[PDB]
């Protein structure tokens, strides 16, 4: 046993951080060495975008679109705020 938190893939120094993806999101982990394991945290991307699973189309952070839903029509807007969220609002015309 050698002092050095080893990740499920590569070994890094004590309290060292590294970029690793989980299922589909890139989270940077912070090893602790030992039974403390390592904690991952969502990393800040560069191509912030907003995807609409309602029409299967993609938009960029700071864009808007009009799509119907539930016998109605929602003017969903694409946001980001250093993250990447999708705000959906109603707008029956």
């Amino acid at each position: 046993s050698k002092p050095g938190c080893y990740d499920n893939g590569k070994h890094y120094q004590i309290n060292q951080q590294w970029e690793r993806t989980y299922l589909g999101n890139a989270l940077v982990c912070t090893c602790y060495g030992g039974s403390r394991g390592f904690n991952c945290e969502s990393k800040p991307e560069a191509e912030e975008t907003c995807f609409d699973k309602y029409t299967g189309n993609t938009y960029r952070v700071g864009d808007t679109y009009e799509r119907p839903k539930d016998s109605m029509i929602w003017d969903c807007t694409c946001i980001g705020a250093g993250r990447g969220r999708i705000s959906c609002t109603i707008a029956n015309r």
Partner: peptide, 24 residues
């Protein structure tokens, strides 16, 4: 006009834990 906001992926924190591959 009725706001809703279903968000997307507000941050993400895991806690992967695994022992060392040794002691056979």
């Amino acid at each position: 006009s009725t706001t809703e906001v279903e968000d997307s992926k507000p941050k993400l924190s895991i806690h992967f834990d695994n022992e060392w591959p040794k002691e056979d």
